[PDB]
Amino acid sequence: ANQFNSAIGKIQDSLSSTASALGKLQNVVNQNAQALNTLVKQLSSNFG
Amino acid sequence: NKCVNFNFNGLTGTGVLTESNKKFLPFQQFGRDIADTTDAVRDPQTLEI
Numbered sequence: 001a002n003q004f005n006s007a008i009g010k011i012q013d014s015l016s017s018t019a020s021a022l023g024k025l026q027n028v029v030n031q032n033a034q035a036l037n038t039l040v041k042q043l044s045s046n047f048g
Numbered sequence: 049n050k051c052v053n054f055n056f057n058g059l060t061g062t063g064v065l066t067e068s069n070k071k072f073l074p075f076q077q078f079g080r081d082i083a084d085t086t087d088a089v090r091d092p093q094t095l096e097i
């Protein structure tokens with residue numbers, strides 16, 4: 001029980017400390033935003 | 049606040065106009081969005097944005 005409680009404590013500390021731990025989710029949100037922005041930027045193009 | 053067709057200086061478009069806190073400096077007359085579409089204009093009869 002003390003090991004389990006201490007290991008759950010280390011999860012809160014880890015998530016409070018680093019930004020990169022959720023990179024697998026932030027990359028999805030970033031690719032959705034980047035793909036929407038690229039589609040808006042192609043309204044600027046002449047295409048000739 | 050009503051939707052209209054508009055034409056300022058030959059910039060024909062469609063939309064709703066609004067009094068803007070976007071401070072154009074005196075050399076500018078049109079503002080453009082990320083899409084290369086105008087999103088603000090300085091009226092050619094009352095100098096207001």
Ligand SMILES: *[C@@H]1O[C@H](CO)[C@@H](O)[C@H](O)[C@H]1NC(C)=O
Nearest residue numbers: 090091092093094095096097
């Ligand atoms: C023309 O617009 C100006 C502002 O640029 C305004 O002061 C003036 O009253 C207008 N002209 C006439 C004939 O009213």
